[PDB]
């Protein structure tokens, strides 16, 4: 393997190798209309081929990242198309690289990914197989740039299974539409985890999702060794890293060998395993991805004797500290399969704390006897707000919900763009929808690592233009620490209000033309404005503005002019708005 280009290409196969590329072209220039990109894609491809023919062919030894930049700058469009992606080609790798990278857009200006009708849609399958997912990886992809590309690929297999089954049947929309909004939130779900995975990476370090997934992987596989979970946490990150930093092919690749040697293994790993091991590898490795828990194994020791008892605590944290505190959260995450992973991770770094100040002292099993009892307020502080907002959720149900976090984070984070916490509030009522419902010791675990995403979403929306101080710091802060620090933020009594905008209740008439779906986005939206002009408003008013906004659409989409409705009820909200709000 002096031919990167060919080893890649023969170990995952053309057609992996294909999407692979697709996606990594898609990620890197997400403007690119798709014909170039499915240039770029079989140039490379050609490439590939002529090198796998052939090692010793022209360009064959350059590395992934020469050939991906050397088929983009010869590319006529990009300069143009972009302002500092033309930038990037005035550097040499790894500059160039690099560059390509740090403008990667977590919110892209494209419109709303279309879902064409189901007749449409299953005609289109049909007609052409390649062209049909080709423009689906490139759609997704250019919209998600940090999607782990491997389940990205699984996605589009999911897919071609969903149409394959519905598009024949009597009724197409009717079997089509909820599995593909079933399947459309997963892999939303999938590309908010990513997007953390590579955010802890980049912004806190390898250690910071190394910790992470030790955690996870301990309550997946609690009989494991920690010499086993040890190897696949850093094989895993050595995966996350690779896709993350856009070597696609290199992660899927070793995501495979991963899978693979995990079900070589399985007698040792899990039981659970014997499922996924037998799965084609996309399947595979998605099951493993997502495996639910094993049983802990009957018969460990108490938590206290290798942590708290033993003479060596303090030796161990001193001359060894990471090897000390990862069995440590291996040892406490396995018998606990209940908590959140950042729970756990809470409770490590307390752990850690009370060491570093008790190991210091002259009597330091005095000092730390009681450390592991010490957890339960931290264990107790998520519970209270659990409980408080699934009831909440209970009785307001999604919208209401969705629209009640909304005037909170608004008034939280006055500063924060409009679409943002619009699409975070959203998010957030989500998060009810999917775990109220559990069993109250499955809902903790659900909501608050369900909370950390839709943060890290957040935290990466804000980082590139910062605007308000709170967020920046609860988001510079800790990866931990983030769902507590947001949750203490009261209102802001800094913000100064916004004044009154004529423009902002009237958007011409396209608004007429948009899905229930977009409407609620837009009442969303009018909520957040009036929330920053009039941040003490109640409730009830805040609602009745809205009711009004209601109105003015139900009446010009109701009358012939709606133009002209504008006119006599555009201002007029201007109106009945100071009437009620002052
Ligand atoms: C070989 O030793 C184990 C190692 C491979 O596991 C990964 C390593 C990064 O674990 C760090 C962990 C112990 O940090 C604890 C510490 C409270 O976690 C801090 C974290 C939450 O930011
Ligand atoms: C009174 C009620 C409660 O606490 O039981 C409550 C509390 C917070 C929010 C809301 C909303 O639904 C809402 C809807 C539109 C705009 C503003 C608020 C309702
Ligand atoms: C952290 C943040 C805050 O209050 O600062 C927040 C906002 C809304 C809700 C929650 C929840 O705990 C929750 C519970 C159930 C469903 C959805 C969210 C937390
Ligand atoms: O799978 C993607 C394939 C079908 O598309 C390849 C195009 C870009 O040439
Ligand atoms: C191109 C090929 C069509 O048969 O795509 C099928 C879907 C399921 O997968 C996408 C490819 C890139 O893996």
Same mark, same amino acid.
């Given at each position: 393997h002096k031919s990167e280009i060919a080893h890649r290409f023969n170990d995952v196969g053309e057609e992996h190798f294909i999407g692979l590329v697709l996606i990594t072209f898609s990620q890197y220039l997400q403007k690119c209309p798709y014909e170039e990109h499915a240039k770029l894609v079989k140039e490379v491809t050609d490439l590939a081929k002529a090198c796998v023919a052939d090692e010793s062919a022209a360009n064959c030894d350059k590395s992934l990242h020469d050939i991906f930049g050397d088929k983009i700058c010869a590319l006529p469009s990009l300069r143009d198309t972009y302002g500092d992606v033309a930038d990037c080609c005035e550097k040499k790798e790894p500059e160039r690289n690099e560059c390509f990278l740090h403008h990667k857009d977590d919110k892209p200006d494209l419109p709303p990914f279309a879902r064409p009708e189901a007749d449409?849609?299953?005609?289109?399958?049909?007609?052409?197989?390649?062209?049909?997912?080709?423009?689906?990886?490139?759609?997704?992809?250019?919209?998600?740039?940090?999607?782990?590309?491997?389940?990205?690929?699984?996605?589009?297999? =999911? !897919?071609?299974?969903?149409?394959? *089954?519905?598009?024949?049947?009597?009724? &197409?929309?009717? +079997?089509?539409? $909820?599995? @593909?909004?079933?399947?459309?939130?997963?892999?939303?779900?999938?590309?908010?985890?990513?997007?953390?995975?590579?955010?802890?990476?980049?912004?806190?370090?390898?250690?910071?999702?190394?910790?992470?997934?030790?955690?996870?992987?301990?309550?997946?596989?609690?009989?494991?060794?920690?010499?086993?979970?040890?190897?696949?946490?850093?094989?895993?990150?050595?995966?996350?890293?690779?896709?993350?930093?856009?070597?696609?092919?290199?992660?899927?690749?070793?995501?495979?060998?991963?899978? =693979? !040697?995990?079900?070589?293994?399985? *007698?040792?790993?899990?039981?659970?395993? &014997?499922?996924? +091991?037998?799965? $084609?590898? @996309?399947?595979?490795?998605?099951?493993?991805?997502?495996?639910?828990?094993?049983?802990?194994?009957?018969?460990?020791?108490?938590?206290?004797?290798?942590?708290?008892?033993?003479?060596?605590?303090?030796?161990?944290?001193?001359?060894?500290?990471?090897?000390?505190?990862?069995?440590?959260?291996?040892?406490?995450?396995?018998?606990?399969?209940?908590?959140?992973?950042?729970?756990?991770?809470?409770?490590?770094?307390?752990?850690?704390?009370?060491?570093k100040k008790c190991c210091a002292t002259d009597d330091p099993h005095a000092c730390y006897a009681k450390v592991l009892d010490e957890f339960q307020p931290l264990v107790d502080e998520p519970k209270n707000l659990v409980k408080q907002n699934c009831e909440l959720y209970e009785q307001l149900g999604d919208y209401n919900f969705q629209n009640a976090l909304l005037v909170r984070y608004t008034k939280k984070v006055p500063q924060v763009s409009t679409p943002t916490l619009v699409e975070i509030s959203r998010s957030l009522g989500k998060v009810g929808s999917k775990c109220c419902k559990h069993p109250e010791a499955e809902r903790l675990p659900c909501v608050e690592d369900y909370l950390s995403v839709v943060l890290n979403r957040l935290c990466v929306l804000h980082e590139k233009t910062p605007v308000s101080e709170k967020v920046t710091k609860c988001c510079s802060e800790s990866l931990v620490d983030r769902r507590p620090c947001f949750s203490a933020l009261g209102p802001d009594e800094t913000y100064v209000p916004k004044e009154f905008n004529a423009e902002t209740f009237t958007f011409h008439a396209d608004i007429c033309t948009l899905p229930e779906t977009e409407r609620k986005i837009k009442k969303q939206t009018a909520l957040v404005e009036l929330v920053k002009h009039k941040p003490h408003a109640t409730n009830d008013q805040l609602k009745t503005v809205v009711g009004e906004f209601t109105a003015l659409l139900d009446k010009c989409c109701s009358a012939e002019d709606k133009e002209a409705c504008f006119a006599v009820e555009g201002p007029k909200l201007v109106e009945s708005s100071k009437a009620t709000l002052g």
């Open positions: 449409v849609l299953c005609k289109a399958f049909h007609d052409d197989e390649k062209a049909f997912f080709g423009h689906y990886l490139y759609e997704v992809a250019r919209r998600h740039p940090y999607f782990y590309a491997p389940e990205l690929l699984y996605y589009a297999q =999911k !897919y071609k299974a969903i149409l394959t *089954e519905c598009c024949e049947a009597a009724d &197409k929309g009717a +079997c089509l539409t $909820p599995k @593909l909004d079933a399947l459309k939130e997963k892999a939303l779900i999938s590309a908010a985890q990513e997007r953390l995975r590579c955010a802890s990476i980049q912004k806190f370090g390898d250690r910071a999702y190394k910790a992470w997934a030790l955690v996870r992987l301990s309550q997946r596989f609690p009989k494991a060794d920690f010499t086993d979970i040890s190897k696949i946490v850093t094989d895993l990150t050595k995966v996350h890293k690779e896709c993350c930093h856009g070597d696609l092919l290199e992660c899927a690749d070793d995501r495979a060998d991963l899978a =693979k !040697y995990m079900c070589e293994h399985q *007698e040792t790993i899990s039981s659970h395993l &014997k499922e996924c +091991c037998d799965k $084609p590898i @996309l399947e595979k490795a998605h099951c493993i991805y997502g495996l639910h828990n094993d049983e802990t194994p009957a018969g460990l020791p108490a938590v206290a004797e290798e942590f708290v008892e033993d003479k060596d605590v303090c030796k161990n944290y001193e001359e060894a500290k990471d090897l000390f505190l990862g069995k440590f959260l291996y040892e406490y995450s396995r018998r606990h399969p209940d908590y959140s992973v950042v729970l756990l991770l809470r409770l490590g770094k307390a752990y850690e704390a009370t060491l």
